[PDB]
Amino acid sequence: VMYYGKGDVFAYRTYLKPLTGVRTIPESPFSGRDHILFGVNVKISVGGTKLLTSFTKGDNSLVVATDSMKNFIQKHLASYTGTTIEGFLEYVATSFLKKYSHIEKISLIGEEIPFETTFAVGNRAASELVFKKSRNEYATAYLNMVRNEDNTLNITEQQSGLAGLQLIKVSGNSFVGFIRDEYTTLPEDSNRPLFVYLNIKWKYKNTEDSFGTNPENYVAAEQIRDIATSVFHETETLSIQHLIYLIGRRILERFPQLQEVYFESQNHTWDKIVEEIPESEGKVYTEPRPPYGFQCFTVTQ
Amino acid sequence: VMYYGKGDVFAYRTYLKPLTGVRTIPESPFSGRDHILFGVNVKISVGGTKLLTSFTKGDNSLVVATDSMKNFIQKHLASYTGTTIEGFLEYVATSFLKKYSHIEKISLIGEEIPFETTFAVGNRAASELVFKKSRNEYATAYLNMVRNEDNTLNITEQQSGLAGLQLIKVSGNSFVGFIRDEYTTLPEDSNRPLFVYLNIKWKYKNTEDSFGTNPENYVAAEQIRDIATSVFHETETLSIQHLIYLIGRRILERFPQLQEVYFESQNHTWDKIVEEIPESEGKVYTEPRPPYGFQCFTVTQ
Amino acid sequence: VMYYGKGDVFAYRTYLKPLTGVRTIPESPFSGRDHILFGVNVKISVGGTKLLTSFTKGDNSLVVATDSMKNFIQKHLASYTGTTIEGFLEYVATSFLKKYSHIEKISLIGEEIPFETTFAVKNGNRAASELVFKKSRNEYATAYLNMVRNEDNTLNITEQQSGLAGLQLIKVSGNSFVGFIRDEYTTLPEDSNRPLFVYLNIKWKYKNTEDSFGTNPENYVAAEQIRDIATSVFHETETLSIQHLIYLIGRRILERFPQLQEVYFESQNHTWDKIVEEIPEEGKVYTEPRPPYGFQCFTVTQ
Amino acid sequence: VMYYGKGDVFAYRTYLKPLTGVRTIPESPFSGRDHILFGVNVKISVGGTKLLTSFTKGDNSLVVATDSMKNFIQKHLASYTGTTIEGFLEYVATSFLKKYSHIEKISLIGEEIPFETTFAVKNGNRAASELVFKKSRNEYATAYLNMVRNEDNTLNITEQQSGLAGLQLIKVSGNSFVGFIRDEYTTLPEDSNRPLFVYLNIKWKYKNTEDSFGTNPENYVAAEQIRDIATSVFHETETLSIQHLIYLIGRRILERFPQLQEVYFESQNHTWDKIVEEIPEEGKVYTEPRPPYGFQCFTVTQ
Ligand SMILES: O=c1[nH]c(=O)c2nn[nH]c2[nH]1
Ligand SMILES: O=c1[nH]c(=O)c2nn[nH]c2[nH]1
Ligand SMILES: O=c1[nH]c(=O)c2nn[nH]c2[nH]1
Ligand SMILES: O=c1[nH]c(=O)c2nn[nH]c2[nH]1
Ligand code: NA
Ligand code: NA
Ligand code: NA
Ligand code: NA
């Protein structure tokens, strides 16, 4: 391995060109983003054989300073004329390889820094000025671009995602029928309040569709979130494994331009404390000990 | 000082009695809570002269185990027949002093663990089953109760609050006219994107009104949140100090049953990177260095 | 309430005057501080009735920008000629009130950012490095100071407190917790031998605030020495509870430092849950508990 | 991809077999581990094509509950008779594949939960305590292991890696960063003497996986010794960049441990910003930077 770069490059842009005309799906009201505020956290990694002596000899002649890479990203957010993080990553990548001929490979991660609307008043409406910083789920994007021997540039990998989704379904979930042996102490549960954390990532058949230039073909993280919550509600779940497969199948049915969906899920279900409350369908639970189950699974189109 | 207790007592209750009929205000749509899911993080502290020898002699005869205090709280969440955190704290407090005659003083903090609705589908609606765990703002409550010499119990202190509100207003804020001397390097800014964190706490004229038994008199954290966002939108702010005073005045005008409102605010405004973008009203900003300004201020009715 | 200020004012100073001339105790080899690297995180709060209209009218005329308070702290760390965080806070507070006549009260907190020595081979042998330090995320010293301006424009310290924060200690045996109340709320078993794991925050107040500054260092009480008393007493004691332990720690502190007026403890119980009791042919296995934690708050006075 | 498992499996063991018989190096006094207290955080991932219908059909017949995997790990820490995290992972992996025939692949990560010695006065003198330990939030050792079941039901290790995580080192002088590209994106000044602050994660692979287990301890490479090489080289070197430094650290590691095949570095730059350059009558003042951090990823091979 030989690469270097800059992490935690925060950049907030006001009044990015709005994303509009995204084809809708029945699980989600999403049709676009107003982009009054567009926040992103970028990580940039660059590589190339000509970087060797920066390591082996302490020669900085071909070192773009990581601080300069931060300036590059922030200046390019000011000049970007597109409408998505995926497209912003492409713009940065192409511009960086064009600028620095000694770099053979660039890898970028962009994480949305999400904001929510707030109420302002003779009637409450969404404010165009005041927004709430959200620490809940957020969109992500990843891009790798290389310079070939014939000096053409090529995207070698692209992936979009949704991170930090935390969903609890109070009833309508079972976990029964698993292996019972000398190591098993978990009771079977025919009705648990399954609490899952979800990170969902998708890849497109055609990299162009990720940029949003033709919004009809763009798959928004907001729509993925809404599919996940709908499928979870609809399904008598039999395990997290069962749930995530069904979510993936629905995503790929709604978005035929997608090639695959990948899931990283964790189980954070609470421990039950009070099983029966007189005169109520209610129950009391509490936080479990730290160990958490997880699942990782790809569904392909 | 001499007290002991239990912290991080998480307790999640399904199907608490709904809070309904809260008198509305124009800044907020809030009228109640369905309480399908009711999550709280409780801290309990107890004191009394009879605890001395548990410290000075290692005598545990009058030590209620902190683990038992956790069981007490979780069992009482199962039996609570009310509709608010404030009322739950009163129920726990009265029950604990009634149970343990050697305790002279109990202090409780309750923090909401908030959950948000999600979409499920032939039309999207809010799910009654699937909820999103939120890491954004949340309601709080605090209660202190004592046993008097004539053996009556009395609430000595009650306070409600909203914590973790993070609001950014992209324009319509200035900070000018402050002291310029040998220590001043901050440029005056006639139009900054003020980003404030807010913790807001209120006290009632009549402790009864905090419980929610008469919802007409209950002041919900959701309504406080919506007043804050409305006032921030409405105001050409001149500093955080100026903004929080105005928020407090509005709160006390809307809620005459309140005696005071207290604010703890922090300044997290971003540093500007790009001041002018051709053909746009947009700008680019980034995260500042760690130091943060803060303000603390009480407004009284 | 009405005040404002700046938090997370980090400041790192190289080559502060070393702390030496301290008075030793049996429980600690502490003999001073080299101060090649001195880091502090400062919070500053200021008040005064003349600040009212900055809130009620948006009048910034008497507002010292919080950014300027950060500059003030950082510049004064460069000029500070003393040897302790406590003395640094006094230097900042006195200087700030002298600069800003409309401020009536200042409150300061300083938290040490601790570094540990590393070793290097050079010129034939391994020795402590004067250049390379390891940042520590473990325990650290703290200080608190409040100062006021009186009607006659004199300045008085109104409260001072020192402390040690973030000490996490586990004793594998020699602790019991038995004899507590057993009623309809009790499910905790009696335990004659548990691996008690405590978090300790310990704070002390001096009889004479001058002794906190270090200008006569024999009278200073170092957080390092308090740390070492805590670990020694925990080892020495067949503990009957955390309450029992912290009282005995406090007694030892006050016996070793007669110039202290009191010591205050905030302790938390983070003891692990037992998984395996018997291992064939003296060990056991434990794991992390559920989140709820017991805590204790207790003062011992001289 | 298809796998599942359990994360944050904390396990604390008392009185593990001590590690001794290690081979020393000039840069480190490390001589073994007492193992009075041995803590580990384990993540376990398992796969196999027979798990498909647990996802596609909700059939739990071949699902080992993740809770049971936690039980498995905790119970095997009680029975483990070796002396290293690397050996513990092998013991767990081999045992798990032997128990569960439908599992084709297991991946394990173990992270040391480190504790430091404390001292106590007893029977007339201050000495290291055998009972009281301080939990550390600083650097810690790591291990990684992947094992597979072949068609003939033999088991093979397919990847092994050891490491040191969380090392944070600041060198106050004797570092430069000059000569980098100066163009329309450059605003960083050249600096002939900066207080370089690096975070280091260092990972190593052995030529022969057996040497990682500790059963012949003279061939084991301890994270403590790697830590001490890193601090020594940082002191010894007039650094020209972090890239320069980590290459030299890697060279020294590979020279001192010829049984290693390679060493991999993930470094981050957290150097403070300068506030005061000149202090009257050699110190300076620095403060925390904005969040963006440079990083480097680099392998040195034998
Ligand atoms: O959904 C689940 N999948 C699992 O693999 C599992 N293991 N324990 N609980 C579980 N729940
Ligand atoms: O609103 C503000 N109040 C302040 O006191 C301040 N100080 N710096 N910036 C500031 N902004
Ligand atoms: O030392 C202890 N003190 C307590 O009060 C307590 N309660 N549960 N366990 C405990 N341990
Ligand atoms: O050591 C460094 N390497 C780098 O690549 C770099 N970029 N900015 N500062 C730096 N320091
Ligand atoms: Na739709
Ligand atoms: Na209303
Ligand atoms: Na000395
Ligand atoms: Na030895």
> How far is residue A54's CA from residue A37's CA, in Å, rounded to a whole number?
39
Its sign, for the CA torsion A76, A78, A80, A85, is: positive
> How far is residue C70's CA from residue C7's CA, in Å, rounded to a whole number?
9
Tokens linked to A14: 């006001």
> How far is residue C5's CA from residue C66's CA, in Å, rounded to a whole number?
6
Q: Contact at 8 Å (CB) between D244 and A58?
A: yes
Give the orientation angle of helix C85-99 with respect to helix C66-79, to 10 degrees. 130
Query: Ligand 7 centroid vs B133 CA: distance in angstroms?
Result: 54
Ion ligand 7 — residues with CB under 5 Å? C 31-32
| Cβ-defined contact of D74 to C16 (cutoff 8 Å) | no
Give the orientation angle of helix C242-256 with respect to helix C223-236, to 10 degrees. 130
Task: Report the alpha-carbon angle A162-A164-A166, nearest 5.
Answer: 115
Contacts of D among chains (3+ CB pairs under 8 A):
A, B, C
Residue type, B43: K
Residue type, B277: I
Residue of C nearest to D167 (CA): C134
Residue of D nearest to C229 (CA): D120
* Neighboring chain D residues of A63 at a CB cutoff of 8 Å: 179-181, 241, 243
For ligand 1, is residue A195 a contact (CB within 6 Å)?
no
Residue D28: closest CA among D175, D164, D196: D164
Residue C117: closest CA among D113, D238, D232, D285: D232
Please tell me what DSSP assigns to residue C49.
G
C243 labeled part of a ligand binding site: yes
Query: Ligand 5 centroid vs B123 CA: distance in angstroms?
Result: 9
Residues in chain B: 301
For ligand 3, is residue B67 a contact (CB within 6 Å)?
yes
Protein residues with CB under 6 Å of any ligand 2 atom: B 175, 186, 239-241, 267, 293; C 4, 63, 65-67
| D123 contact partners, CB below 8 Å, separation of at least 6 | none
Contacts of A among chains (3+ CB pairs under 8 A):
B, C, D
Mapping DSSP onto H, E and C, the string for chain B reads CEEEEEEEEEEEEECCCCECCCCCECCECCCCECCCEEEEEEEEEEECHHHHHHHHCCCCCCCCCHHHHHHHHHHHHHHCCCCCHHHHHHHHHHHHHHHCCCCCEEEEEEEEECEEEEEECCCCEEEEEEEEECCCCEEEEEEEEEECCCCCEEEEEEEEEEEEEEEEECCCECECCCCCCCCCCCCCECCCCCEEEEEEEEEECCHHHHCCCCHHHCCCHHHHHHHHHHHHHHCCECCHHHHHHHHHHHHHHHCCCEEEEEEEEEECCCEEEECCCCCCCCCEEECCCCCEEEEEEEEEC
C142 labeled part of a ligand binding site: no
| B180 contact partners, CB below 8 Å, separation of at least 6 | none
Distances (CA, A) of D165 to D141, D268, D299: 6, 12, 16
Q: What is the DSSP string of chain A?
A: -EEEEEEEEEEEEESPPPB--PPPBTTB----B--SEEEEEEEEEEE-GGGHHHHHT---TT---HHHHHHHHHHHHHH--SSSHHHHHHHHHHHHHHH-TT--EEEEEEEEE-EEEEEE----EEEEEEEEE--S-EEEEEEEEEE-TTS-EEEEEEEEEEEEEEEEESSSB-B-S---STT--PPPBSS---EEEEEEEEEESSGGGGS-SSGGG---HHHHHHHHHHHHHH--BS-HHHHHHHHHHHHHHH-TTEEEEEEEEEE-PPEEEES--TTSS--EEEPPPS-EEEEEEEEE-
**How are beta strands D197-206 and A125-133 bridged, if at all?**
unpaired
Residue of C nearest to D35 (CA): C283
> How far is residue C119's CA from residue C165's CA, in Å, rounded to a whole number?
26
Q: Is B189 left (phi over 0), alpha (psi -120 to 50) or beta?
A: beta
Among the bound ligands, the one closest to the CA of A227:
5
| Cβ-defined contact of A10 to D293 (cutoff 8 Å) | no
> Largest alpha-carbon pair distance within chain D?
77
Tokens linked to C250: 């406090």
Phi, psi of C298 (to 5 degrees): -155, 130
Give the orientation angle of helix D66-79 with respect to helix D85-99, to 10 degrees. 130
| Cβ-defined contact of C287 to A287 (cutoff 8 Å) | no
> How far is residue B43's CA from residue D262's CA, in Å, rounded to a whole number?
51
Three-state DSSP state, C201: strand
For ligand 3, is residue C241 a contact (CB within 6 Å)?
yes
Residue A286: closest CA among C292, C287, B35, C288: C292
CA distance B285 to chain C (A): 18
Mutate to test the interface with A, among C270, C276, C290 (most CBs of A within 10 A): C290
* Neighboring chain B residues of A133 at a CB cutoff of 8 Å: 166-168, 195
| Cβ-defined contact of A55 to D6 (cutoff 8 Å) | no
CA distance D2 to chain A (A): 5
Integer-rounded Cα Rg, in Å, for chain A is: 23
Mutate to test the interface with C, among D37, D125, D172 (most CBs of C within 10 A): D172
Please tell me what DSSP assigns to residue C175.
B
| C232 contact partners, CB below 8 Å, separation of at least 6 | C27, C252, D119, D120, D121, D126
> How far is residue C202's CA from residue C226's CA, in Å, rounded to a whole number?
8
For ligand 1, is residue A255 a contact (CB within 6 Å)?
no
Q: What technique determined this structure? A: X-ray
Mapping DSSP onto H, E and C, the string for chain D reads CEEEEEEEEEEEEECCCCECCCCCECCECCCCECCCEEEEEEEEEEECHHHHHHHHCCCCCCCCCHHHHHHHHHHHHHHCCCCCHHHHHHHHHHHHHHHCCCCCEEEEEEEECCEEEEEEEECCEEEEEEEEEEECCCCEEEEEEEEEECCCCCEEEEEEEEEEEEEEEEECCCECECCCCCCCCCCCCCECCCCCEEEEEEEEEECCHHHHCCCCHHHCCCHHHHHHHHHHHHHHCCECCHHHHHHHHHHHHHHHCCCEEEEEEEEEECCCEEEECCCCCCCCEEECCCCCEEEEEEEEEC
Integer-rounded Cα Rg, in Å, for chain D is: 23
Tokens linked to D247: 């290459």
The verdict on whether D17 is a catalytic residue reads yes
Nearest to A176 among D2, D10, D60 (CB): D60
For ligand 1, is residue A146 a contact (CB within 6 Å)?
no
* Neighboring chain C residues of B176 at a CB cutoff of 8 Å: 60
Binding-site residues of B for urate, in ranges, read 66-67, 175, 192, 240-241, 267
Give the orientation angle of helix A221-234 with respect to helix A240-254, to 10 degrees. 130
Residue type, D24: T
Query: Ligand 1 centroid vs A240 CA: distance in angstroms?
Result: 7
Query: Ligand 8 centroid vs D237 CA: distance in angstroms?
Result: 30
CA dihedral B7, B13, B17, B19 (to 10 degrees): 60
The 10 Å CB-count burial string (b at 16+, else e) for C3-25 is bbbbbbbbbbbbebbebeebeeb
Nearest atom of ligand 4 to the alpha carbon of A65: 7
CA dihedral C124, C126, C130, C131 (to 10 degrees): 90
Binding-site residues of B, in ranges, read 66-67, 175, 192, 240-241, 267
Nearest to A119 among B14, B27, B121 (CB): B27
Task: Report the alpha-carbon angle C8-C12-C18, nearest 5.
Answer: 130
Tokens linked to D199: 């975070």
Please tell me what DSSP assigns to residue C17.
P
The 10 Å CB-count burial string (b at 16+, else e) for C229-239 is bbbbbbbbbeb
Residue of A nearest to D65 (CA): A178
The 10 Å CB-count burial string (b at 16+, else e) for B14-26 is bbbbebeebbebe
Tokens 């009186």 appear where?
Answer: C150
Mutate to test the interface with C, among B43, B49, B64, B68 (most CBs of C within 10 A): B68
